[PDB]
Amino acid sequence: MSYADSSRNAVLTNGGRTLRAECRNADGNWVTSELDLDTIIGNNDGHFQWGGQNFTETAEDIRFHPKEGAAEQPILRARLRDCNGEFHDRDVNLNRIQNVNGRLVFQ
Numbered sequence: 001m002s003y004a005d006s007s008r009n010a011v012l013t014n015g016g017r018t019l020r021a022e023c024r025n026a027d028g029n030w031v032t033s034e035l036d037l038d039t040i041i042g043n044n045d046g047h048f049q050w051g052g053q054n055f056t057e058t059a060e061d062i063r064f065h066p067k068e069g070a071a072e073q074p075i076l077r078a079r080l081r082d083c084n085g086e087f088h089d090r091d092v093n094l095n096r097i098q099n100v101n102g103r104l105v106f107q
């Protein structure tokens, strides 16, 4: 279960830092919500880290597939710099992000 189950039209903005969606609220209205991903996802030795910060700082080829695959998962993908300064392609499923009454939150 993620925000995606009750949201639509999810994209990244601000150069891949910002998750922006329309989230169905308590009454079933569709309201705009944005979540700064740099506040909740870090780069830990070239891996995405929930509860980290600033993953975009040197990340390259940031992209987002809101409905990736037959499982339709919200997948963020990026090349991330490891402790040795080498980059590797990485992915993280955004199901730690939830829609709470129309707002995108991190749980």
Ligand SMILES: OC[C@H]1O[C@@](CO)(O[C@H]2O[C@H](CO)[C@@H](O)[C@H](O)[C@H]2O)[C@@H](O)[C@@H]1O
Binding pocket: 041, 042, 043, 044, 045, 046, 047, 052, 053, 054, 055, 056, 057, 058, 059, 081, 082, 083
């Ligand atoms: O330069 C990236 C490389 O440095 C480390 C050191 O901890 O992470 C730093 O940079 C990240 C953004 O790229 C931040 O998320 C992290 O908080 C900051 O310490 C390594 O973890 C990373 O591989």
Ligand SMILES: OC[C@H]1O[C@@](CO)(O[C@H]2O[C@H](CO)[C@@H](O)[C@H](O)[C@H]2O)[C@@H](O)[C@@H]1O
Binding pocket: 001, 002, 003, 004, 005, 006, 007, 024, 025, 026, 097, 098, 099, 100, 101, 102
């Ligand atoms: O359906 C929208 C409405 O559902 C709630 C109920 O708590 O959200 C939770 O359940 C959804 C699945 O229907 C998830 O998408 C969502 O992330 C989860 O928080 C309300 O918050 C939301 O307004």
